[PDB]
Design a protein around this ligand. Sequence first.
Ligand SMILES: Nc1ncnc2c1ncn2[C@@H]1O[C@H](COP(=O)(O)OP(=O)(O)OP(=O)(O)O)[C@@H](O)[C@H]1O
Ligand SMILES: [Cl-]
Ligand SMILES: [Cl-]
Ligand SMILES: [Mg+2]
Length: 264
Amino acid sequence: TGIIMENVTAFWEEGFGELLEKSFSHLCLVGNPVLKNINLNIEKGEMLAITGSTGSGKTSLLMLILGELEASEGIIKHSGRVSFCSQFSWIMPGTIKENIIRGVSYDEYRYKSVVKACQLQQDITKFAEQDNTVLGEGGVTLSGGQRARISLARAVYKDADLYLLDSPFGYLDVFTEEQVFESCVCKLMANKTRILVTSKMEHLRKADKILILHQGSSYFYGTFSELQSLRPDFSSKLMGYDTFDQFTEERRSSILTETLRRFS
Ligand SMILES: Nc1ncnc2c1ncn2[C@@H]1O[C@H](COP(=O)(O)OP(=O)(O)OP(=O)(O)O)[C@@H](O)[C@H]1O
Ligand SMILES: [Cl-]
Ligand SMILES: [Cl-]
Ligand SMILES: [Mg+2]
């Protein structure tokens, strides 16, 4: 189904700061909002790209949809099974395959296609036991991207109506990340309602709707075209760099943040 948030606002409630960690008790006392006057309308099959200054409420907006945070004000509609893929890539003890199809019914196909799209083929081929290689909790010897991709694969493979993808593209193997973005998010999932948190411009360009957060507020919402005209200062500064999307995730974020401060 689609997802809608009409003038939503949420506040810090004890525990949510404890949940996220997977001073808070001051924010809770003061009663400051984590998100404020959040507005969005996504149609089934559309892909929403979320971005913004670091620590602006992106991961939180997600927890909201997940129902781990409630909307003190405003309406929030969406339905069906939702699949979440956190910034923290978690690996459970078992095989690469086991990690991906765990708790869900198997489908030779569906599986092969996800594994392919997520670019896991280039990985499991380096292993003597392919996707049958046994991992130890946390997949410690694996690389950041390898875990991220395995983590994504697991999320994508699940059958759901809404897919919440929190910053999966933030590692050094940037080229692979670009391939994954296309074949998985843009192609393979093209007809699935999906929200993607990111710091890569290209992801905005190719999104149906954009959403830029900053200091818990909505700095912008709307298509990419609307973005260029209604936020010329921002859009100009960001399209300035030739190869921004290949800057470290840290560098990308530090710019978005600084830029967002200048044109608040
Ligand atoms: N109203 C507020 N007053 C003071 N600090 C806040 C407020 N709202 C958020 N913050 C700070 O900014 C953070 C934003 O939370 P959240 O992680 O949901 O946003 P985010 O953009 O996903 O952050 P990150 O991108 O680093 O994961 C809060 O955890 C807290 O550190
Ligand atoms: Cl390692
Ligand atoms: Cl690692
Ligand atoms: Mg986050």
